[PDB]
Design a protein around this ligand. Structure first.
Ligand SMILES: O=N[O-]
Ligand SMILES: O=N[O-]
Ligand SMILES: O=N[O-]
Ligand SMILES: O=N[O-]
Ligand SMILES: O=N[O-]
Ligand SMILES: O=N[O-]
Ligand code: NA
Ligand code: NA
Ligand code: NA
Ligand code: NA
Ligand code: NA
Ligand code: NA
Lengths: 244, 245, 244, 245, 245, 244
């Protein structure tokens, strides 16, 4: 048994690009499992799942991702509603197994609705639309949640895709610093290192086709019928370039 | 079949109803305290004695704070006995307990109409005195000198008038928050504001005391005129908050 | 049961200034209970209480307020005397109940004698008279303990009262910083925030009448027969104004 | 008698044999991992499946890191199942365990000849990308972009050529060590170098893969010519490391 | 009746007797050690061997310190055995125990008349050497180079002469306190002085060894003349302490 | 029993310089017991002790003084050798009793060989000869371990002795800072305060006579036949003078 010979023979094995890249995708970072999230919503929720999901998205966007914590500072009626949601959907916090629901996961799996809701919810978010407008004129409300990444069509022409992601990153920079106060004294590049992984995971996920995602981007007014980013997106992308 | 992509796209096609969503926002919003429950508990525990006891507890809250066991350690024998009896009768707690528990601060907040009037008498015995406030803004409104005041604000006031009322009140909240907490020593105005704006806005926007009755109190307190326009003293304090550090 | 109506009716209740101010006084900060202190001294001490109290005042002023701690660095004779005092008077430390004695409480309750003793004890105090003299010429020794606050007549004309308290505060500023080393890097205003509460409590307490307190101030040479502060008091008040 | 001074002086008179002492130095030198044991364990646990599984584990090491339980917490259901099976079959551990335990990093290191080739494909999915490296030194050699590369270095190369190869590799190691560890934020080049030079030199000088076969890999990778002279890209990267901060 | 105000005012009318109060001050003053008890314990434990053992313990205190168990860990077999026997015989402890316990430092302090003389021989083996002291003040008095020296000071010396003696001694205490404690690194002269002045003054003012016998030692040590006037070397060291940092 | 009289009579006792200085030496700091180290080596090692000691010195100089720690990062063969050494010689770490061996103690007790080995081992030491050469030209390799102190003849003329010790201290300054990283931000004088005690202990120990130590210094080329330090020693001494 010549271990040195086994080693050199191993090195002589093909470097199969197709095979290796498939493994990369198989082992890639995944933030959440959209198909499982919806399956669980339908399972626990039955006939009530759609309305309950909408409530859970409003909760995620205006109060956060800790159901037991938010209950401590809430009206009697609101607390009762959340209590019932926890018991019905077995809601957890943070990053449990894929067989468990969280408020943030509901928002992410149903991003088409979430992003639209941001238009309505703007002034009740941790970073408001008004604040974003100070950084870039008419900042797109549809981009104002990490859930937006799942609406991005990665097959857009490179320059258009980059503009969409840079624009969205301007929000992510502000949002990350509000949610995690310890990121306030860190550079843009350092903060980006913390939000790019989940962003790219959703951009490149197998959930919602390229064509359907671009349809959402067009419906949201983020790109025109030719896929070119809106003036507001271009402004925000430029603002990200010079952001600190 | 179980087409989750299809279910997701049809979910996205459903109405994003502004009126419906805004109702949910209100249902799920931050609540600092439950005024109706506070008064219910006062009446329950206090019976015929609740009104007088509530006034005592407000004076206690405004001059000694929100820690009944702590304040008893530095008090006259007679005062200590009064507070001891109040704790046992009303089951008083410290800080922020459940909705089913009373605290001194919650009594003051639930009964803000009286609390804000009492501030006129109590000015020189508050943690931040009226005299101190006067150095920051001339003739500072005494009615604004407790977090309880937020529950007297009418959120339907014209944007500029509402902003002035809140900015003026925030001048006090800035000083008060720094005095009661030596821990919040070297932080900026905005960092201190982050500690008081959430409970402030919750009381401003709560369903307790109608918009009209709130404005009536503001008028009675001399903080706004018949049209809701803030007084000279309020405007002065709002400007002082803008330039405050 | 209309809770909103109950609330507005409550607001319509009179704001009785006399009633409210009486409550303020009833609930006011009290540092110690002078009447109880003397009662306990007489009870535990019997025929020996007066002499023992004098010893306890010397202990409080030259060693501090921790009887068990000071015993660890004391002559055999001194240790035995303190041991006996602890056992006889059940002496405690810090802020126990009003039914318990401490060395500092004895000094405070019997401030008339304590303040006179300071003349003799000056160079053995944590802040010496010599040190005080560097800050203000001929600093009044009678003011050199927190116990002095109980000798202040709050009915003195405002300017005279202010001068007395400012003069006393010059000492309190130095003393607080010696006893609590963490106050050394804090501003005068910040240090004042820590000594003004117990000071004012004693100034405004119901123990020893206005007339009798002013008699002490006159006997100590701190005010003249017309209540006007001495030159030394005025000097110290001015020194406090410009102190850091 | 028991003359310890005499025994000590006669000990000092004994040979200080350079060849003997240098052999002891080698015997007792730092070892980061045991390549022969790694391959033995792979063959033992894997059987007919070991080669394909090893390739998977190398891709896993290079794109997700050295913590199999941690990476599983953010992975597809299918990916998680593959990794779970790999852990159970090969008894995978994290960090630096005993010689009798496999880790993902050890698989990559023991099979560096293949690992370094895979880096050409994997460039844009590594913690520090090839594109990032190109900004620091133009056309940075992809084959050098893993600590595994140290095991491909022939220590018998002429002094200047060896130094260039190692300096060029160290440019990557500087960036890589800072990226994977936010803990090593505000430290200098030399302080970061202190964390990677020991395992680097151990692999460079190890008895695994002959000097001649190592140089053959370097030649095949286009890093040196037929005489062992480093490529233009290697020289550029060596210079970049000199002036790096 | 129980008129506590009356009792308090009549208490204030009682004599504030300077002589009586000053006696109490002395009774209750800080005591660092009890010299009479130290010598009693030495005689008790040591019997016929106490004098020689005391000298050994003083040499031990001055050259190794006040931790007998610690010093044994870095000592010859013979030295260790001597110290071990001394610990068992005299029940030696570290730091500051009760009056009924001996320490090495207490032996040196209780027998300061001999300790200060031994410093002349021991100069170059102390934590701060005489040579080091000479760089700060020329011909620094060796007799002053231990805290034990404080017990040789006559507090009845004229104010200026006493101050000079203590200032000169304090120059050593400043250096000594900083050397034996790496913990007291970045503190000022006054902050270091706060750590040594209390035990210094206690020994200066203690009832052990008469004022006259203390001055006799000072004269014998060449530190003062027949009139109590400090030597040139003492004056030089006093001036050095004034300008020291 | 007059304790004051006993005290003054004690002071009247002779200050015997011979007696006192003998006690100083008896109680002096000792880093290790060379005679005991060799006795233990011979006892545990029997016929193998000399070869094993050489291995242990190479271990001490190239890996350090923690046998169980170094084993964790070592070849299978090397680990087995060290394991056997630990079991045979009952090797410990740090500062155990004199009846226990450590790797550093073997190197120190057999310094004559250790110092020669440094010539061979230079580039594998924590501070290399190459590094030392940057500070002082042709730095003497024989000085590059704390073990060297036991080769120093304290009877050398003062200037020659000082030059030897200053030269050796240049290495000790660099070495101490590498082994103890917390000494990096400390002054030369502060670092010296940590290495001078063990240095002087070995310089002045009763192990290996003055004549034999000087013979080693001459054989190592550190002094000439007249005891005068080499040019390299003088260079290093000067480098220590101006070192930070
Ligand atoms: O991790 N986003 O599918
Ligand atoms: O928390 N104010 O309703
Ligand atoms: O608290 N002084 O009565
Ligand atoms: O640790 N590389 O053999
Ligand atoms: O503490 N000296 O008596
Ligand atoms: O401590 N050296 O013998
Ligand atoms: Na998404
Ligand atoms: Na309302
Ligand atoms: Na008093
Ligand atoms: Na090899
Ligand atoms: Na005396
Ligand atoms: Na040695």
């Amino acid at each position: 048994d010549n271990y040195q010979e086994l080693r050199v023979q191993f090195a002589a094995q093909a470097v199969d690009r197709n095979e290796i890249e498939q493994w990369v995708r198989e082992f890639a970072y995944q933030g959440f499992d959209a198909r499982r999230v919806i399956e669980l919503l339908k399972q626990y929720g039955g006939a009530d799942w759609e309305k309950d999901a909408k409530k859970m998205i409003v909760l995620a966007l205006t109060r956060g991702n800790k159901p037991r914590r938010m209950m401590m500072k809430m009206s009697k009626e609101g607390k009762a509603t959340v209590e019932a949601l926890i018991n019905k959907y077995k809601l957890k916090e943070g990053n449990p197994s894929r067989d468990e629901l969280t408020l943030s996961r509901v928002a992410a799996a149903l991003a088409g609705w979430t992003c639209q809701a941001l238009v309505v919810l703007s002034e009740w978010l941790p970073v408001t639309g008004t604040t974003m407008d100070g950084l870039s004129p008419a900042y797109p409300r549809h981009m104002m949640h990490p859930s937006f990444a799942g609406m991005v069509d990665p097959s857009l022409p490179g320059d258009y895709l980059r503009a969409i992601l840079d624009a969205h990153s301007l929000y992510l920079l502000q949002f990350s610093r509000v949610i995690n106060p310890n990121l306030r004294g860190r550079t843009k590049e350092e903060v980006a290192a913390t939000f790019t992984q989940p962003m790219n995971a959703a951009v490149n996920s197998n959930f919602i086709s390229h064509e359907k995602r671009r349809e959402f981007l067009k419906a949201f007014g983020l790109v025109d019928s030719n896929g070119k980013p809106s003036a507001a997106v271009m402004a925000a992308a430029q603002a990200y370039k010079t952001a600190a």
